[PDB]
Design a protein around this nucleic acid. Structure first.
Length: 54
DNA sequence: TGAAGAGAAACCAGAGTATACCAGTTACTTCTGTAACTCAATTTTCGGGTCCTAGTACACTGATGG
């Protein structure tokens, strides 16, 4: 196998990749981010994520 | 009085003979390039579109299950 394939399978079957549980600090971060990058009813979550960690 | 040849009327292949193609070459032309202006016809080439089928991202929906 390649190192890339092994890492790829590990990630695609990892469980600590995402955080899977919300914290109040993370909620404040999400709210501050959404209020900054809304343009209306348009909330680009793919642009928002890249400031949310995990 | 037959014998060993003498003569005679048939076939039969073959060697010149007769064709039968089949190349073997001498002049005698055109056709190049360059130049030029002309104009139209035609081609090439060339950057960009154009349409189309097939995925792709992405926010949301709609359950779903523990």
């Amino acid at each position: 196998r390649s190192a890339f394939q092994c890492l790829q399978k590990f990630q695609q079957h990892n469980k600590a990749l995402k955080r899977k549980e919300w914290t109040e600090e993370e909620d404040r971060m999400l709210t501050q981010l959404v209020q900054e990058m809304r343009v209306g009813s348009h909330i680009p979550y793919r642009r928002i994520v890249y400031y949310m960690e995990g």
